[PDB]
């Protein structure tokens, strides 16, 4: 029934609130001027970056930023793994399939949720403590200065769909249970969970956005634009890995990127 699908939707929503401390609702409070705690410290050039590091050496700026992204990617994988484990039926899957789904899903989810922390002018960092302008990220020396630009461009169009947290929670579940990841051993029970999640998603969108026609369809088209961000991103990272003194890639991220599309 509709009701079983409502109940799945709510269950994913609560576990998303538990798993992810900075929700899209809070990011949007922060960014709009609403909320009544302090405005984020903004980082727009080298000097502001430096002063931001005492409010929020040895190495070059583009590399400091790179390595900061790694720290937050690592924690994001962790949060996403915990959310995955609350998706009904996920932990009954072959463990090797759980790993494959995370390995390919995590980046797609990361860039979906990054869009929550973004506007056309920059991005929240350190959990809403800071705001790092897009210009400044764009201004970094090659190849570092175009690392983020494709995330921003995706974010601006994705953000126009005006999804909320309750929507996003089912969307990210759907992405995680994609039956076409390379090397999956047993596709069937993954497509059966995903079938149920997609039905949950479609109900959710009709209920939550009754005025937004074909939002389900528009949102399916995004699950495959994400694919492109991911492949471009892996390509640019293979380049950095080749051309930069100390790759220094966190070993969680090395597990994820090894033998990846």
């Amino acid at each position: 029934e509709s009701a079983d699908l409502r109940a799945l939707a709510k269950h994913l929503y609560d576990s998303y609130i538990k798993s992810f401390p900075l929700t899209k609702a809070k990011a949007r409070a922060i960014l709009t001027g609403k909320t009544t705690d302090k405005s984020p410290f903004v980082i727009y050039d080298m000097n502001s970056l430096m002063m931001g590091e005492d409010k929020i050496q040895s190495k070059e700026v583009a590399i400091r930023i790179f390595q900061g992204c790694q720290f937050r990617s690592v924690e994001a994988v962790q949060e996403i793994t915990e959310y995955a484990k609350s998706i009904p039926g996920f932990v009954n899957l072959d463990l090797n399939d759980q790993v494959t789904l995370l390995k390919y899903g995590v980046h797609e989810i990361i860039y979906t949720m990054l869009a929550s922390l973004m506007n056309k002018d920059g991005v929240l960092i350190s959990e809403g403590q800071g705001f790092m302008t897009r210009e400044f990220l764009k201004s970094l020396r090659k190849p570092f200065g175009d690392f983020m630009e494709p995330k921003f461009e995706f974010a601006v169009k994705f953000n126009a769909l005006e999804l909320d947290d309750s929507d996003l929670a089912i969307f990210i579940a759907v992405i995680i249970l994609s039956g076409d990841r390379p090397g999956l051993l047993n596709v069937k029970p993954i497509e059966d969970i995903q079938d149920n999640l997609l039905q949950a998603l479609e109900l959710q969108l009709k209920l939550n956005h009754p005025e937004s026609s074909q939002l389900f369809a528009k949102l399916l088209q995004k699950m495959t634009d994400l694919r492109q961000i991911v492949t471009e991103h892996v390509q640019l990272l293979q380049v950095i890995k080749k051309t930069e003194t100390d790759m220094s890639l966190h070993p969680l991220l090395q597990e994820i990127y090894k033998d990846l599309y």
């Binding site: 793994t81 484990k85 932990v91 463990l95 790993v99 995370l102 969680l252 597990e255």
Partner: peptide
């Protein structure tokens, strides 16, 4: 092999 991933999965 994916050692970290396996440990975060079973927990």
């Amino acid at each position: 092999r994916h050692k970290i991933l396996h440990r975060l999965l079973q927990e």
